[PDB]
Design a protein around this ligand. Sequence first.
Ligand SMILES: O=C(O)CCc1nc2ccccc2s1
Ligand SMILES: [Zn+2]
Ligand SMILES: [Zn+2]
Ligand SMILES: [Zn+2]
Length: 100
Amino acid sequence: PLPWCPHLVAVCPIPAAGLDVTQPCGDCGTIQENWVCLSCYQVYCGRYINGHMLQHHGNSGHPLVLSYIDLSAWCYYCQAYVHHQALLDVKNIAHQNKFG
Ligand SMILES: O=C(O)CCc1nc2ccccc2s1
Ligand SMILES: [Zn+2]
Ligand SMILES: [Zn+2]
Ligand SMILES: [Zn+2]
């Protein structure tokens, strides 16, 4: 995984409501393999379910998404996982919600 990418500038502030790692897909309602968009904080499912987060990337151009299964961050433009200081706050808020 990359230690930086040129889309980190599109990571937006975390809503004051926080994250809900059990939130369903906003399109199909599945509870399985969802991701949260780090630009607009909508929640959509992964490629192995109904691919709604990939569709969101296509229709918005939003680059970076966070996995609610393992808290990895994927960039659709770079086609890589990214770790950076700029992702720690949102990873941490998710980790707290997920693990208690
Ligand atoms: O839409 C999703 O499932 C989330 C982002 C990812 N897409 C790929 C594609 C190939 C390998 C790893 C990943 S993580
Ligand atoms: Zn879905
Ligand atoms: Zn988005
Ligand atoms: Zn990138």
